[PDB]
Symmetry: C3
Subunit: 334 residues, 3 copies
């Protein structure tokens, strides 16, 4: 019926992204992906707070899927019998049936296969959306990720010049709502079902207890810091499925930024801080000019420093004293 070549993709866990071409001479293909839902209790902070998570492929965020404009994305969604709830998937990149959600509702023990054509370029959120009050709950429990649909000629600056990245990372930000008991300690639950009543009362007050990248406080730091070298052009894809974020690379800039995340629009240049609308993904690229540590944060600094929303980059290379120099080191006031 639809007679195109098929290509399988092996998804990798964020913040890494599966191998792909930017500009390509391939024509349209059916690109095949598989997502398996996992409900699990996880640790979200350095004090040992636990959380009833619901995930695609066992990670928060779900993995980034990368295709090109005109491809057909065929996803097998699997809800094993070890889960307790029905789940589905909705792609903001897709057209019709509530983004696919109306065609993908599966009980524990079932799977479904959905195909959608990638007619719109950019980065887009996907998330679970089973219906009614379950929709927010599933999403803030971790069931969201993103897809990137590239132009076949790769990215451009709007002003006919190509924009090629040397690497891409995917930072998924997650607002989490963990209730406290009378003592003021965070509560733990035996199942997602049991967490629901207390969690929903807290959610409706709209203030998260934690805001984290890659599912945990400190996930993208120390040994798991993002890396680059001076001279490298890095693309950072940032998603937030429920709540606004304001990304900022401390010590750097957004050289080229698509804050609404859609490549039919020219990027903005030379930003300090950009804005990711809740329910969207955006993308920023920067060429590193200096070595050392950078922090990538949401620039509500309370959220960054106290609620979990800080990642690090470690950058190698030579210090440029023309760009910045300590003229005189700390010394007593004359």
């Amino acid at each position: 019926d639809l007679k195109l070549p098929r290509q399988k993709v092996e998804l990798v866990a964020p913040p890494f992204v599966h191998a792909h071409e930017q500009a390509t001479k391939q024509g349209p293909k059916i690109v095949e992906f598989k997502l398996t839902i996992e409900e699990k209790k996880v640790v979200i902070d350095e004090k040992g707070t636990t959380f009833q998570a619901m995930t695609f492929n066992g990670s928060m965020p779900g993995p980034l899927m990368v295709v090109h404009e005109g491809d057909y994305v065929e996803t097998t969604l699997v809800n094993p019998a070890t889960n307790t709830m029905p789940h589905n998937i909705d792609f903001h990149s897709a057209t019709g049936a509530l983004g696919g959600g109306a065609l993908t509702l599966i009980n524990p023990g079932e799977q479904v296969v959905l195909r959608w054509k990638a007619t719109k370029t950019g980065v887009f959120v996907y998330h679970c959306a089973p219906g009614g009050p379950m929709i927010p709950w599933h999403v803030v429990s971790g069931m969201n990720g993103a897809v990137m649909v590239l132009p076949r000629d790769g990215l451009n600056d709007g002003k006919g010049h190509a924009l090629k990245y040397d690497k891409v990372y995917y930072v998924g930000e997650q607002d989490m709502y963990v209730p406290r008991d009378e003592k003021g300690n965070f509560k733990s639950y035996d199942s997602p079902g049991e967490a629901f009543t207390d969690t929903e009362e807290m959610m409706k007050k709209l203030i998260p207890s934690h805001v984290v990248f890659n599912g945990k406080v400190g996930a993208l730091t120390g040994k798991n810091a993002l890396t680059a070298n001076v001279g490298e052009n890095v693309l950072i894809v940032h998603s937030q499925a429920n709540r606004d974020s304001r990304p900022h690379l401390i010590g750097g800039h957004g050289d080229y930024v698509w804050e609404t995340g859609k490549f039919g629009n020219a990027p903005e240049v030379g930003l300090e801080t950009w804005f990711i609308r809740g329910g969207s993904a955006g993308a920023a690229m920067y060429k590193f000019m200096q070595p050392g540590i950078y922090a990538y944060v949401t620039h509500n600094l309370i959220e960054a420093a106290d609620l979990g929303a800080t990642a690090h980059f470690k950058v190698e290379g030579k210090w440029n004293d023309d760009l910045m120099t300590q003229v005189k080191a700390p010394a007593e006031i004359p």
Copy 2:
């Protein structure tokens, strides 16, 4: 003095918009509108919660006024003796006197006539603004709507091509602050005056109890769903007079979006989610490609699913399997 032709407009209740031309060969006219203030107790949710509303023309939002660049808008504002408070009107589209507010303060029993020239194209908020602490209270009680000022040549994509809509809807989003008693039930009041003290304490904490389109949970659903057909280009005008919103059409896109709402700027293309700044209106147009149900939401999903901010479209036409198809229906895992 000002010797131009006069044209009366009969306003219609949102989400409908009074009949108007897009591109027009008419020159400037004085366009005449009348707004009558109504204070009333209304029901805002399916559990029967009540609210002391203050409205233009008896609706939340007030009706959309549509004119063209260079027109003169002459508004008669009427505050009948059955109301209890002074009221006025401020147009963000207008220049001078706090948008008209400083020239339109009227006690119960009075009316006033204001004229302003429409020098700026786009969609703009209007709202009551009597002075001091009353300003937020009147606005979050429902006294806000919007005006659309069209270019005389109609809308364009910035890239010399015309953008004609087949229909336009106006979705006004309202953040509401209903206090709870010691039990945890929503309180009811006999008058706006009596609601004021409890309402103001809640407002200053910045978290709404409800966020609704067209004045009530479920207002734009079921029999009152928005409608379209595959192939129709629909313009959705969205306003929020006090608090940010992030509109999203589930299963669709914003083909052409003016998120800051001003037609001197080219629209952005192919958005998933857009951002309406508190105190502004924006506009998005989409051509439907698939039939079925779509939800139009703010993509803070807690607000959408739990606080009231969801509308529906029912779209007629033929399903397009090239864009999306269920390859295999729900089935047991092999």
Copy 3:
């Protein structure tokens, strides 16, 4: 080593800005600035509420520094022995070492000299960032300001036409977190250290007690209103180092707006309300067309009217009845 001419600047307190050229025939210079940190208890509202402030040069916000693209900015930061905490400075305009913060940490009694090259045009935040949980606390205590880096040819509209302002004001917005005691009154503290524990618990709940321009409720009103005349083009630079804002000039517009604040991007035109992302500065220019009072607010009106975020302009000149007129004054309903 770096052999360029040196120029000293005398900083002035906001909302004024030190004298500078827009378009300039000067080449790159080393521009020298000095900032002295002051910790002090201040009054932030008309009821006499006090607050433990931490400031650059004794003001909230810190003063605006103005330079041109390609200049080298050399800042002497001074932390006198009368202060109690270590401090530093981070410039969003600068490249490397966490914006300078990693090179400027000074204990009470010390000073440091940092030089950075201004490679990026626009308005940018600077703020203290000592490390960890101290970062948000220092910033919301008042330790933030902004810098403007102008193109050497001055500003343009993107469409080759020059945009010259007759004056510029700097409005720094500050979200403040003052705890309440059991009575419900605001608490006072003897030192910043003692304020810390209660302040941090409140901060993590993300709702400010006050939102103020220029450090106090009513600071930019009455005798300290901003001024202009009909026909004057005024540039308003607005910063928020931690939390989003949505500026709006009541009775006017943003004729040309850089809401992300970066002059490599063309401005948007004819805005009603614009958006300043937390951790950024933006800039709007407007030519006054009418005399009288204007209010400049964040258009969350609860914040504007009840939490402190309102400034005034008093504009002189002749009223234009073509733009707006009271056709009929308040009168009894026929």
